[PDB]
Amino acid sequence: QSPGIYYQSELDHNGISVYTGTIISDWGGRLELEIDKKARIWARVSRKQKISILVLSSAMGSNLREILENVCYPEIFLSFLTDKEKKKIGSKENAILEFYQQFSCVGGDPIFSESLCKELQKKFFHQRCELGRIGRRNINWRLNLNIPQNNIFLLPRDILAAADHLIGMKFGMGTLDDMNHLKNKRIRSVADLLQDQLGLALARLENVVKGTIGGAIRHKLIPTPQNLVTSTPLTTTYESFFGLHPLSQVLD
Amino acid sequence: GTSTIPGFNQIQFEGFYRFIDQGLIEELSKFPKIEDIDHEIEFQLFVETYQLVEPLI
Amino acid sequence: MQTPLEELYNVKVERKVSQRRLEELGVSRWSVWKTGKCKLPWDWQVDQLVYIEEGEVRVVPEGSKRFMQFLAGDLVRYPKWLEADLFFNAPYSERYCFKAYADD
Amino acid sequence: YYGLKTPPYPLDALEPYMSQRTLEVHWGKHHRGYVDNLNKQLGKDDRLYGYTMEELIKATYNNGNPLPEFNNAAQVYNHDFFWESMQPGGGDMPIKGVLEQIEKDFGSFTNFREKFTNAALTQFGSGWVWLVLKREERRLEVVKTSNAINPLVWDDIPIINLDVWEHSYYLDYKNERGKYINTFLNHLVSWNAAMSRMARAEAFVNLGEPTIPIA
Amino acid sequence: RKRNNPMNPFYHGTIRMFSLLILSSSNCFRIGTIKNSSGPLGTAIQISNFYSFLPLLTYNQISVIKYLQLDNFKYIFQVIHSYLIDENGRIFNLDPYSNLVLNPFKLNWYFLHQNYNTIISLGQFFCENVCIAKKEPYLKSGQVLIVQRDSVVIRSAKPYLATPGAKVHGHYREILYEGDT
Amino acid sequence: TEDEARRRNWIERGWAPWEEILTPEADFARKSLNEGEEVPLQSPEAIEAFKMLRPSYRKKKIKEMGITEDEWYAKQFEIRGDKPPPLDTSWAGPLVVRQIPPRDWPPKGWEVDRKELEFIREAHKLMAERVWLEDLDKDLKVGEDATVDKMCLERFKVFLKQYNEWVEANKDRLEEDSYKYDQDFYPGRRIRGKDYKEGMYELPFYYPGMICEGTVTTLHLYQGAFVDIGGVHEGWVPIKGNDWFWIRHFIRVGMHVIVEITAKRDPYRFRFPLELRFVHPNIDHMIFNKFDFPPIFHRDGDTNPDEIRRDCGRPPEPRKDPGSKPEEEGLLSDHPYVDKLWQLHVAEQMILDDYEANPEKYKGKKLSELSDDEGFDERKEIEHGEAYYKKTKLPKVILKTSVKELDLEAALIERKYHNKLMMEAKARGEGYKIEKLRRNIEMDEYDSLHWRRSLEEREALLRDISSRQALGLPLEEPGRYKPGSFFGKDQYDPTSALYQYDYWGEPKNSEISKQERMKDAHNKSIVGKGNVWYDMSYDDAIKQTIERR
Amino acid sequence: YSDSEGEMHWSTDVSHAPEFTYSNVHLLPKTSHLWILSGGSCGSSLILFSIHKDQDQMNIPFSDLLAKRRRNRFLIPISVEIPINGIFRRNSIFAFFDDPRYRRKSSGILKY
Amino acid sequence: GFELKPPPYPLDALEPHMSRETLDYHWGKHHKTYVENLNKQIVGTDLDGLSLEEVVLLSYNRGNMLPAFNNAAQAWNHEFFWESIQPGGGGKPSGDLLRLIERDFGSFSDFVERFKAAAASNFGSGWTWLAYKANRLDVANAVNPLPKEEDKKLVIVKTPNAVNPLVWDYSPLLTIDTWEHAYYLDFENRRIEYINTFMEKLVSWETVSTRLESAMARAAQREQ
Ligand SMILES: [Fe+3]
Numbered sequence A: 001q002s003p004g005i006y007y008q009s010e011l012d013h014n015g016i017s018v019y020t021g022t023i024i025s026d027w028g029g030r031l032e033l034e035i036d037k038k039a040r041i042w043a044r045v046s047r048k049q050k051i052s053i054l055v056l057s058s059a060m061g062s063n064l065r066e067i068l069e070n071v072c073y074p075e076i077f078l079s080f081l082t083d084k085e086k087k088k089i090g091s092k093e094n095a096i097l098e099f100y101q102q103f104s105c106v107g108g109d110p111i112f113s114e115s116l117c118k119e120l121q122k123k124f125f126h127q128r129c130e131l132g133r134i135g136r137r138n139i140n141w142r143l144n145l146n147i148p149q150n151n152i153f154l155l156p157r158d159i160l161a162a163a164d165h166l167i168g169m170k171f172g173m174g175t176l177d178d179m180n181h182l183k184n185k186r187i188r189s190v191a192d193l194l195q196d197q198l199g200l201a202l203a204r205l206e207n208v209v210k211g212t213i214g215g216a217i218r219h220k221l222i223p224t225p226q227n228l229v230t231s232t233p234l235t236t237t238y239e240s241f242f243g244l245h246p247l248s249q250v251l252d
Numbered sequence B: 001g002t003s004t005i006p007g008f009n010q011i012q013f014e015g016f017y018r019f020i021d022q023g024l025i026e027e028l029s030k031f032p033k034i035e036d037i038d039h040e041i042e043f044q045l046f047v048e049t050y051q052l053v054e055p056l057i
Numbered sequence C: 001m002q003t004p005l006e007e008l009y010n011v012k013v014e015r016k017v018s019q020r021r022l023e024e025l026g027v028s029r030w031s032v033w034k035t036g037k038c039k040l041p042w043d044w045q046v047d048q049l050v051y052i053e054e055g056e057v058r059v060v061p062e063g064s065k066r067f068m069q070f071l072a073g074d075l076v077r078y079p080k081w082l083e084a085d086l087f088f089n090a091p092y093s094e095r096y097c098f099k100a101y102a103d104d
Numbered sequence D: 001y002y003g004l005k006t007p008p009y010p011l012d013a014l015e016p017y018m019s020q021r022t023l024e025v026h027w028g029k030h031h032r033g034y035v036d037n038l039n040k041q042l043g044k045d046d047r048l049y050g051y052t053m054e055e056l057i058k059a060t061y062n063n064g065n066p067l068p069e070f071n072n073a074a075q076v077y078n079h080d081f082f083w084e085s086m087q088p089g090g091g092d093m094p095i096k097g098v099l100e101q102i103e104k105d106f107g108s109f110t111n112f113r114e115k116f117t118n119a120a121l122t123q124f125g126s127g128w129v130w131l132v133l134k135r136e137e138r139r140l141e142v143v144k145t146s147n148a149i150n151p152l153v154w155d156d157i158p159i160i161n162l163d164v165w166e167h168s169y170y171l172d173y174k175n176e177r178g179k180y181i182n183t184f185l186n187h188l189v190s191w192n193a194a195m196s197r198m199a200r201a202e203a204f205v206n207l208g209e210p211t212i213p214i215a
Numbered sequence E: 001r002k003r004n005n006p007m008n009p010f011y012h013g014t015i016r017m018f019s020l021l022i023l024s025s026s027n028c029f030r031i032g033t034i035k036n037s038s039g040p041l042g043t044a045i046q047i048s049n050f051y052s053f054l055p056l057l058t059y060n061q062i063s064v065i066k067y068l069q070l071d072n073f074k075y076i077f078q079v080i081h082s083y084l085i086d087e088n089g090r091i092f093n094l095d096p097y098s099n100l101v102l103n104p105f106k107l108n109w110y111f112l113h114q115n116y117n118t119i120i121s122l123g124q125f126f127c128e129n130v131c132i133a134k135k136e137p138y139l140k141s142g143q144v145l146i147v148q149r150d151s152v153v154i155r156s157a158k159p160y161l162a163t164p165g166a167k168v169h170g171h172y173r174e175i176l177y178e179g180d181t
Numbered sequence F: 001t002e003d004e005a006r007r008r009n010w011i012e013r014g015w016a017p018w019e020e021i022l023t024p025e026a027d028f029a030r031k032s033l034n035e036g037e038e039v040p041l042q043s044p045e046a047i048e049a050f051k052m053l054r055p056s057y058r059k060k061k062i063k064e065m066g067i068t069e070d071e072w073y074a075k076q077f078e079i080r081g082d083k084p085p086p087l088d089t090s091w092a093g094p095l096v097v098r099q100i101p102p103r104d105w106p107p108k109g110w111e112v113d114r115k116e117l118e119f120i121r122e123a124h125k126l127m128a129e130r131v132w133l134e135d136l137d138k139d140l141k142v143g144e145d146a147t148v149d150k151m152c153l154e155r156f157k158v159f160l161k162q163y164n165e166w167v168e169a170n171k172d173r174l175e176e177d178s179y180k181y182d183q184d185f186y187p188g189r190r191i192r193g194k195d196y197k198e199g200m201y202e203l204p205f206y207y208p209g210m211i212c213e214g215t216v217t218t219l220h221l222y223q224g225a226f227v228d229i230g231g232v233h234e235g236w237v238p239i240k241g242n243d244w245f246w247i248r249h250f251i252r253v254g255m256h257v258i259v260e261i262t263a264k265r266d267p268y269r270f271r272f273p274l275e276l277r278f279v280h281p282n283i284d285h286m287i288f289n290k291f292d293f294p295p296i297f298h299r300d301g302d303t304n305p306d307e308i309r310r311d312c313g314r315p316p317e318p319r320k321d322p323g324s325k326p327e328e329e330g331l332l333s334d335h336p337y338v339d340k341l342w343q344l345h346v347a348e349q350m351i352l353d354d355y356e357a358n359p360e361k362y363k364g365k366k367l368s369e370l371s372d373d374e375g376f377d378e379r380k381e382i383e384h385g386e387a388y389y390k391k392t393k394l395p396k397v398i399l400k401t402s403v404k405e406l407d408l409e410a411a412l413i414e415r416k417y418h419n420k421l422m423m424e425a426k427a428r429g430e431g432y433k434i435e436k437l438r439r440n441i442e443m444d445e446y447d448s449l450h451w452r453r454s455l456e457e458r459e460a461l462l463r464d465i466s467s468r469q470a471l472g473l474p475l476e477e478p479g480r481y482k483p484g485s486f487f488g489k490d491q492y493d494p495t496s497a498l499y500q501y502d503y504w505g506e507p508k509n510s511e512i513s514k515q516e517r518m519k520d521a522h523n524k525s526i527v528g529k530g531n532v533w534y535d536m537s538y539d540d541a542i543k544q545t546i547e548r549r
Numbered sequence G: 001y002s003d004s005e006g007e008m009h010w011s012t013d014v015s016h017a018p019e020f021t022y023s024n025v026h027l028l029p030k031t032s033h034l035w036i037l038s039g040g041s042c043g044s045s046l047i048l049f050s051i052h053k054d055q056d057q058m059n060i061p062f063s064d065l066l067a068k069r070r071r072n073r074f075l076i077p078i079s080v081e082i083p084i085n086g087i088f089r090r091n092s093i094f095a096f097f098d099d100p101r102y103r104r105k106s107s108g109i110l111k112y
Numbered sequence H: 001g002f003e004l005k006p007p008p009y010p011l012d013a014l015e016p017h018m019s020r021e022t023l024d025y026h027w028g029k030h031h032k033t034y035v036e037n038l039n040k041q042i043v044g045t046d047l048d049g050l051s052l053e054e055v056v057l058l059s060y061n062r063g064n065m066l067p068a069f070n071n072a073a074q075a076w077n078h079e080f081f082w083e084s085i086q087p088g089g090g091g092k093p094s095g096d097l098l099r100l101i102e103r104d105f106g107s108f109s110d111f112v113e114r115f116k117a118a119a120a121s122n123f124g125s126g127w128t129w130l131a132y133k134a135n136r137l138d139v140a141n142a143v144n145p146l147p148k149e150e151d152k153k154l155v156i157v158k159t160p161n162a163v164n165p166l167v168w169d170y171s172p173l174l175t176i177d178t179w180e181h182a183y184y185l186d187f188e189n190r191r192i193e194y195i196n197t198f199m200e201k202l203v204s205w206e207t208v209s210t211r212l213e214s215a216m217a218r219a220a221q222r223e224q
């Protein structure tokens, strides 16, 4: 499936239509935007971890004032504002901590720290917020956005713009996305598969060097640059890519 | 392939050539300038100096 | 187009100005601005009378593909808000009088 | 060229509300001076000559950078509009078309008079006070402006004119402009002229409502 | 600004706006006294009884009830009475009960036309095979855009039949591109 | 509700219930699908529509009605719905006219007798003479006392003779220009070819305020009614949109009307030079859709939008308001000619240095009589190029320079003054540093002139601001610098939060991160691990050491 | 689907009120024909909204002595370092001067 | 709280140049009203205590005039105008004032004709001023490192309504009230006659010279 935003609707047990918009990143990260029975929008991440849009929007710093103005229905978002969520929304950090609590489902109050954001960024921002060149292209089209091509990251406007169509499409405005359409696909050739393994090869080399530079430093020696790098990372990860990867097959 | 049937291996041929031109440089970048905890010893790569030599076998 | 640039942009030209008008305006007691081959991008946020005695200037308004040809001995009043491009192909020297509202 | 048009009344017809001495100076040389100065300027340029009175006012206004001819041309129009804006035995209440338009765009005539007076009371320096018809908004408004400027430069049709230049009233009232404004609205304002001006403006504004079929 | 700038003179279709559409030949097509003559009657002058710089010359059923002063009730005329004033101030009519005007070009009096006391209408929509006469070709689908002496110009339009319960996707006069629902 | 929605559609979106003339098939489809999919048709209209599907039945029906087929076809094109109330066009007093020559006479580029023109122009002052309705009875000449010979129209006769001379002189050129500029004929264009008749009035024969007798010739749904008033160009009454739904009952092709010229325009720029209004019949109460600006042509010679919008009366192209006041900004003192002065200065210095290095070349030839190489072009004095430096293809610009525009003698004398004084300083065991040369003084004086320009323009601007704020005149050009949200609701402002992905920090693969680490590597190879002692301004470096030396 | 580009028109039998207060979807109480009035496309034209207006007829398609300092610009004929890409980012070091008065040919440590 | 001071000359001393009726109405009905309105406005505001020059420069607000600018500026200009007229006025100046008038205008006749033309051409209510060019702008790079002593000259300026040269940091020296209320009761619309009578009978060259010396002193004290 190609990166971008995809709109789907599935019937519930009673046949009530439930619409859904899904963000697909450059690495398969799916960010599901759903409308529940009470019209409350939840940025579902896993089968259990459920997070509201306002907490997620204020997690990055979207002030509660501007969220209402940029949508056609400020009332819908304001109706779901419990007095507990408003206090956490009012400050940027309290939204981050509450977002961490709902995303991680961990009992207790986390402390705001630089490592917490970095730990969240690798798990959440690194896997679920980088669209890529292709992902930006589709989002500019499907959400009808005049955003520059070089922006390869999921801009906060896209989420708020997506919620406009998601609620708007519920009232007959637009058509659902065809998931089996070839315009929603991508083809990965040997160019993408060999380049990706090079991403693993060099990341495997830095861990070799880090152990090597630390080992030689503890001996107070001056190591030549050749001896800090061995050929095993590149050679083995390509030797084991053709051996083990299912997409690498023996020529018939 | 505008006026003739294209080569049946042209997709493999063009993909691999794309990897050599842009795949190596785009991936030899992003390689961190490795520094120790003490910041005494800094190891880095000069990606513009990258080369490939023809196989010996 | 059919209409010359001077009429379109409201530029007063008093070519071969007589001595009477020059002494009435007090041009002889004005300052001298000099330039050689250069190019001045300017926007006239104020009126300005200009008398050219030596040199030639070709004036190109913003976006225009034509120019207004001004020689020596001409009295020119550049209007307020004009966004033109001054061009010089030779040593040039002129006398000025920036004019505010009313005045002269 | 434009001739000096006399007011539609004898110069003593406004007594005692406006003394004849004011009439003979406001029209004898004041209004005559603007007329004679304009004709000399129009005798030199064959391009400004040829425009209509309204076209000349807007063309010489030059989008907020008035040409030297703007002051004379605009003041000729304003004084001619001012004389017709006043009639012998004026004042009282407007009737029929001007009546309902005033009470629609201002709430009532009582709200109109206070708004009109404050425009003249707060006009600092020599200028004019206008009751005009907004072309795009299709409503009556009270507009204050200074010097020779008239709402023709905004493509609005004037209806009623009042002159708050000092030379217009510095004899019978001097610095007592406040009661001069009140006297103008009580004894001299011509609402008969406002009817036809709002009738001429109907050729361009159409303050009415369309007939829409039920189908 | 122009100052902060861090070349050298020495060296079809009609716009339709309300959103823009171009009307051209790709969508509009054509289907189909002295002698009285049309011309100027002079420059009307201000009548001071009406306090108007440019004369009104006429009312309508809405303006006459709205902007007619009491003293001008007698001056409304159901027919045209044309006068003429020359450079010296004299007034000429040549008849007080007829329609006589002067031709500025030939300098001679003449009469007006009425004393001023087709099949296809403008804006109508047609189907693809609507007949107008037995000896005439069938009309094409579209709206009547121009009406002339012996012809009309049609802006082509395509009708779409819709049963009750159908849902129109768009407001009135909304621009639809090819392939839009 | 479905009463105000319809009104809003009519007013804001131009809706009108135009009659749809349908074929029997389409009429049957509309009348029969209202009942059901496959049902026995019961509504009598559907039964009749089913019967009308056969034209033989229609022919029998019309034969029974005793009418021919032609007007039955014409009966289809009948206006449905209610009819508007009839028009009672009441005249406001008698029609009092006067033969006044047009004010714009003569046309531009046409020379006539100035005495005759001034005699003509005396008639224009007659607009100030007042006419009272209670006065057209004292000297009413009726009959033989109102004959043309008794008229006093001498100024108009002078205008007529000048007009006839101009027409006979310019008639063919105007038709040639019309053929050259206007490919096809349209109402409002010049009537040319076999359609032209002698005696058609030209445009300078007309002027706003004239009352004309004419015939309606063309009805356009988006433009209005076109009236032939005896000229070579038709008149135009602007009517468009919904207004034609009711006005079509009253304004129809072929009827005679009374029209007043409201405006006369240039046919080259404006589509309809003559703009009219209907005097009789009066439809001012029925016209709601108004033209913001009279439509114009977009010619092939129109390459600048500003020239177009100045040829007509249209506003300038708007742009975002910079938000910085023009008098609070600092004055400018960088004269644009200094760059040429700098180039000449460095050229002279390099020539002098070469002369000092290799003096034997300049033997037997006066320096002032130098010649350029065979091929030195003055039209290619700047050529862009690229060069490699430290494995970097940094751009390079070659500034060509002759020797004629250089004061070689003065530069050589000045250098000899330095070299002689440098030798004296060397002989004294000292060093001499030149503060600035002659060309630097020239640059300084040119900058003084430019800064004087800036200061006087700024003071004039301040006086203008005071006068305008005291008089209400606009500060900046109207129609320019529109406020916010004018350029579409969707605007990408990177500084906003709703477009900033730095919420959890700059991504390590982000473009800024790539540049951020690149400069540190660039800096680290320059300085290293040392600590910043302190930072001082550049102007402070200029100041302190001069005191020291 | 719209076979050609144009603007929508209906005369009767289409409700002028949208079915939902913020949509553009209208219902047909009865049977009617929906018209599409063909028109040319603006497409990717830039337009101006100042010169292009209704009914316009478009006949056209849509050592210091040799150095200098100026506004946000300066010239240089002390050693100057220019980055590989030739691009400077904020707070960068391009010129460094190794003053001879603090050069030492001996070894030791630096105190400050 | 400002106060209105009487003119330093008897109300009957300006005949036949300015009638007593005109003088008393202009002073106690225009200037008095302006001063009293300003005092009413400045009750309880920050403006209290500051001198009138500071009042005008504060109320100018660099263009977006505060509501109190009109009354204060009119009061200051009227105070200036009374001090510039004396019964023994007219004639010609002398000394440095005359050498400066010769330097900036060539001859005295040239200056007086330019001043008369400016006063006559002032359209609408306003003033015509003669001022010393000792202005400093509120922008950097507005300092001239090489003054030529000619940039501080005497210039003729015209202002509408209550505008005075001090808003541009100028030093007013002489004014003539072109507001029609100043002369309508005497000269009506005959503005040329009023200007000629003012210039030849009411111009107090002593006050103009003292103001020129004060402007020179201000420039000198700003020099260091
Ligand atoms: Fe007046």
Ligand SMILES: [Fe+3]
Pocket: H030, H078, H177, H179, H181, H182
């Ligand atoms: Fe005063």
